[PDB]
């Protein structure tokens, strides 16, 4: 890897600089290099890893949706040749490559070394997320297997989070939020999505009284996203 | 589309 | 080049798709491929080329300024090692590479084949612009030569535009706008910047009566930028 | 900073 010669601490320092500069492709390459040093990641470092790749894949997802929309209109009317499909495929392939890279880092060897609930749930949620992003563009004979891989990762993360974390924990909340999005947008299960969002919100509400002002702010921020989705979905 | 989680979680 | 096997028309089509998707690095690579087919560019194609590279270098300039600011603070107080300088240099080198690529396309062979005022002035303005972007980050023994290259290109474009184009022509106006920015920001000549902006604005004002509603809108949009600068500068 | 020209010019 091109980052093999750089110190771990320097990679982390430069990841933070790249974030400030909104250079998320650089940020992701720096954090990939940091992961490949082989040491476990701290809470802050896990968040840097997620911020970097979420922004990279976020740009690819937005582009893919634009191109896919154009492609579907073309098939309603004038023929224009293969270019729209070709370029949609180009972006799609790049997106799939980023997802495969993240999933590879989780499998080699972030997840197997993660023993604390906060790290293990964070990484398993990430695994579900990037299989979900793959599912968003999947159309062939492995769409079903991609969907079940996302579901399986989310479910393992959910089981741990319910046993080991309070209902207001932001990682637990963000996991439940994203699993509910998986149900609604990927798995054709809107009722499951709604039920999960409502129970997650209500169980967090009842635990807010235990929190400091700062933790209350962290938790209510994610709870509002659950509420926004319920308003969209009902 | 639905809202998903921010990347950074405490 | 990686685009050598793709049809010119397909490259243009995909450049327009990339613009819609806000994939400006792709857009620039497609338009570079189109230029390298060796045919002259139409007005629309010249604008696609400029849109693509302006957005690419615009992201690099914004990142460079963030990192340069951090670097200058570090030199006011705790030592943190070479990382800030290294990463600023990385972005700076990538920025310089993009500028060199654009200048290479203009020199091989866009400018020498451009005979009409609209194309020749557009390309000479671009040459001035990308030498100006190089000047923004230049600090060594060639800063003076980079600045004079920008000045020389802008001046040739100005001479042609005053002889061959009406004062409201958007290319002429955008050229004068950018030459005035060169004077203010690069050449330490605020009075020259102000004088050029005012005379450009006033000569355009007096020619607006000749224009259709749509051309009036095109011209007044650029005139407002001249006015915004004069308000900042005085 | 000063405003410069848009990329697309008619
Ligand atoms: Cl980026
Ligand atoms: Cl393509
Ligand atoms: Cl799993
Ligand atoms: Cl881009
Ligand atoms: Cl670097
Ligand atoms: Cl010149
Ligand atoms: Mg070391
Ligand atoms: Mg027809
Ligand atoms: Mg929060
Ligand atoms: Mg051909
Ligand atoms: Mg000190
Ligand atoms: Mg205009």
For residue C108, how far is the Cα from the chain centroid?
Answer: 18
Contacts of D3 in chain C (CB under 8 A): 177, 181, 225, 228-229
Q: Answer for the pair C50, C19: CB distance below 8 angstroms, yes or no.
A: no
Task: Give me the residue from C170, C175, C229 closest to D10, CB to CB.
Answer: C170
State the distance from the centre of ligand 9 to the C-alpha of A205, rounded, in angstroms. Answer: 14
CA A124 to CA A114: how far, in whole Å?
Answer: 10
Domains belonging to chain A, first-starting first, are 1-234 (1.20.190.20)
Q: Which residues contact C120 (CB under 8 A, 6 or more apart)?
A: C111, C114, C157, C160
User: Looking at CA atoms only, how far is residue A84 from chain B in angstroms?
Assistant: 23
Q: Which of A10, A22, A63 comes nearest C63 by C-beta?
A: A22
DSSP helix/strand/coil, A87: helix
CB environment C149-166: b (16+ within 10 A), e (fewer): bbbebbebbbebbeeebe
Q: What is the largest CA-CA distance in chain D?
A: 25
CB C160 within 8 A of CB C137: no
How far, in Å, from the CA of C159 to the mean position of ligand 6? 12
What radius of gyration, in Å, describes the C-alpha atoms of chain A? 19
Which residue of A63, A86, A87 is in closest CB contact with C22? Answer: A63
C62/A21 Cβ within 8 A: yes
> Cβ contacts of residue C58 below 8 Å, gap of 6+?
none
d(CA C194, CA C231): 10
Sorted by sequence, the CB contacts under 8 Å of residue C35 that are 6+ apart come out as C41, C49, C105, C110
Rounded CA separation A68/A140 (Å): 16
Which of C219, C227, C129 has the alpha carbon at shortest distance from C165?
Answer: C219
Comparing CA positions, the residue from C153, C160, C150 lying closest to residue C115 is C160
CB contact under 8 A, B4 and A181: yes
Cα–Cα distances (Å) from C27 to A23, A72, C19, C20, C105, in that order, read 18, 21, 6, 10, 15
CA dihedral C47, C48, C52, C55 (to 10 degrees): 40
Torsion-angle region of A38 (φ positive above 0: left; ψ -120 to 50: alpha; else: beta) = left
Cβ-based contacts of D5 with chain C (< 8 Å): 125, 173-175, 177-178, 222, 225
Q: How far apart are CA A1 and CA A36, in angstroms?
A: 9
Q: Are C176 and C225 in contact (CB under 8 A)?
A: no
Q: How many residues does chain B have?
A: 10
Using N-to-C axis directions, what is the helix angle for A190-205 and A213-233, rounded to 10°? 150
Asked whether the beta carbons of A52 and A121 are under 8 A apart, the reply is no
Candidates A109, A116, A102, A106; CA nearest to A43 is A116
**What b-and-e string marks burial along C65-81, b requiring 16 or more CB atoms within 10 Å of the CB?**
bbbbebeeeeeeeeeee
Tokens, residue A128: 């579900």
Question: Which string of DSSP letters, residue by residue, matches A92-107?
Answer: HHHHHHHHHHHHHHII
Cβ pair B2:A229 closer than 8 A: yes
Tokens of C49: 């080329």
| Burial of residue A1 (number of CB atoms within 10 Å: 0-12, 13-18, 19+) | exposed
**CA A100 – CA A231 distance, rounded (Å):** 33
- Say yes or no for a CB contact (<8 Å) between A81 and C18: no
CA distance C48 to C3: 16
The Cα A63–Cα A79 span in angstroms is 22
> What whole-number distance in Å separates Cα of residue C161 and Cα of residue A96?
49
CA distance C8 to C36: 9
Across the interface, whether the CB atoms of A83 and C18 are under 8 A apart is answered: no
Whether chains C and A touch (3+ CB pairs under 8 A) is answered by yes
CA distance B1 to chain A (A): 8
Q: Among C122, C170, C232, select the one facing D2 at the smallest CB separation.
A: C232
Q: Which two three-digit tokens encode residue C135?
A: 């000047």
Q: How far is the CA of A179 from the centre of ligand 7 (A)?
A: 38
Tokens read off for C47: 């604008």
Give buried/exposed letters for A169-206 (b at 16+ CB in 10 A, else e). bbbbbbbbbbbbbbbbbbbebeeebbebbeebbebbee
Rounded CA-CA distance C111/C125 in Å is 11
Q: How many residues does chain D have?
A: 10
Resolution in A: 1.8
Compute the distance from residue A124 Cα to the ligand 8 centre, in Å.
Answer: 50
- Asked if C17 and A83 come within 8 Å (Cβ–Cβ), the reply is yes
> Both tokens of residue C196?
């050029």
Centre of ligand 7 to C-alpha A10, Å, is 10
Distance (Å, rounded) from C-alpha C128 to C-alpha C103? 9
Nearest to C47 among D1, D4, D7 (CB): D7
Three-state SS string over chain C comes to CCCCCCCHHHHHHHHHHHHHCCCHHHHHHHHHHHHCCCCCCCHHHHHHHHHHHHHHHHHHHHHHHHHHHHHHHHCCCCCCCCHHHHHHHHHHHHHHHHHHHHHHHHHHHHHHHCCCHHHHHHHHHHHHHHHHHHHHHCCCCCHHHHHHHHHHHHHHHHHHHHHHCCCCCHHHHHHHHHHHHHHHHHCCCHHHHHHHHHHHHHHHHCCHHHCCHHHHHHHHHHHHHHHHHHHHHC
CB contact under 8 A, C13 and A91: no
Task: Give the whole-angstrom CA distance, residue C234 versus residue A226.
Answer: 51
Interhelix angle C170-181/C143-164, rounded to 10 degrees, is 150
Contact assessment for residue C205 and residue C219, using Cβ atoms and an 8 Å cutoff = no
Q: Are C102 and C54 in contact (CB under 8 A)?
A: no
Q: Which of B1, B2, B5 sits opposite A222 (nearest CB)?
A: B5
**Nearest 10 degrees: CA dihedral of C125, C126, C129, C133?**
-170
* A30: nearest Cα among A11, A46, A54, A9: A11
Number of Cβ atoms within 10 Å of the Cβ of A44:
11
Torsion, CA A208, CA A212, CA A217, CA A222, rounded to 10: -40
Compute CA A140 distance to the chain's CA centroid, rounded to the nearest angstrom: 22
Q: Hey, CA dihedral for C55, C60, C64, C66, is it positive or negative?
A: positive
Residues A158 and A175 sit within 8 Å (Cβ to Cβ):
yes
Please state, in angstroms and rounded to a whole number, the distance separating the CA atoms of residues A15 and A10.
8
DSSP 3-state percent helix, strand, coil across chain B (nearest 5): 0, 0, 100
Name C54's Cβ contacts closer than 8 Å, sequence gap at least 6.
D7
Contact state of C22 with A70 under an 8 Å Cβ cutoff: no
Q: At what angle do helices C170-181 and C213-233 cross, to 10 degrees?
A: 10
Burial class (CB in 10 A: 0-12, 13-18, 19+), C52: buried
Residue A228 CB-density burial (10 A; 0-12 exposed, 13-18 middle, 19+ buried)? middle
CB burial class (10 A; 0-12, 13-18, 19+) of residue A79? exposed
**CA distance from start to end of chain A:** 48
C10 contacts in chain A (CB < 8 Å): 81, 83
* Cα of C52 vs its chain's centroid, Å: 11
Is A154 within 8 Å of A196 (Cβ atoms)? no
Q: Which residues of D touch C178 (CB under 8 A)?
A: 4-5
- State which residue of chain C sits closest to A12, comparing Cα positions: C83
Residue with tokens 């990484």: A123
Residue C133's closest CA among C54, C19, C15?
Answer: C54
- DSSP code at position A109: I
CA angle A126, A132, A138 (to 5 degrees): 145
All chains having 3 or more CB pairs closer than 8 angstroms to chain A: B, C
Q: How far is CA A13 from CA A4, A39, A48, C84, in A?
A: 15, 16, 11, 8
Distance in angstroms (rounded) separating the CA atoms of residues A114 and A196: 26
DSSP structure class, residue A209: G
Do the chains contact at B9 and A232, CB–CB below 8 Å?
A: no
Q: Distances from the Cα of A99 to the Cαs of A93, A105, C74, in angstroms?
A: 10, 10, 36
Q: Would you call C93 an interface residue with chain D, using a CB distance cutoff of 8 Å?
A: no
């Amino acid at each position: 890897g091109a980052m093999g010669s750089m110190e771990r601490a320097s990679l982390i320092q430069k990841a933070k600089l790249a974030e400030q500069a909104e250079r998320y492709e650089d940020m992701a390459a720096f954090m990939k290099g940091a992961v490949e040093k082989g040491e476990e990641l701290s809470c802050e470092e896990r968040n840097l890893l997620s911020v970097a790749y979420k922004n990279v894949v976020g740009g690819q997802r937005a582009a893919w949706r634009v191109l896919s929309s154009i492609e579907q209109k073309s098939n309603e009317s004038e023929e224009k040749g293969p270019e729209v499909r070709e370029y949609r495929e180009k972006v799609e392939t790049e997106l799939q490559g980023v997802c495969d890279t993240v999933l590879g880092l989780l499998d080699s060897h972030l997840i197997k070394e993660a023993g604390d609930a906060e790290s293990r749930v964070f990484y398993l949620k990430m695994k579900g997320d990037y299989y979900r992003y793959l599912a968003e563009v999947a159309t062939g004979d492995d769409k079903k297997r991609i969907i079940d891989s996302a579901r399986s990762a989310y479910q393992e993360a959910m089981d741990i989070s319910k046993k080991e974390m309070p209902p207001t924990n932001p990682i637990r909340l963000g996991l439940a939020l994203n699993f509910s999005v998986f149900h609604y947008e990927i798995a054709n299960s809107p009722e499951e999505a709604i039920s999960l969002a409502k129970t997650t919100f209500d169980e967090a509400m009842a635990d807010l009284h235990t929190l400091s002002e700062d933790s209350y702010k962290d938790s209510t921020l994610i709870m509002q996203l659950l509420r926004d989705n319920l308003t969209l979905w009902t | 589309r639905s809202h998903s989680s921010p990347a950074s979680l405490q």
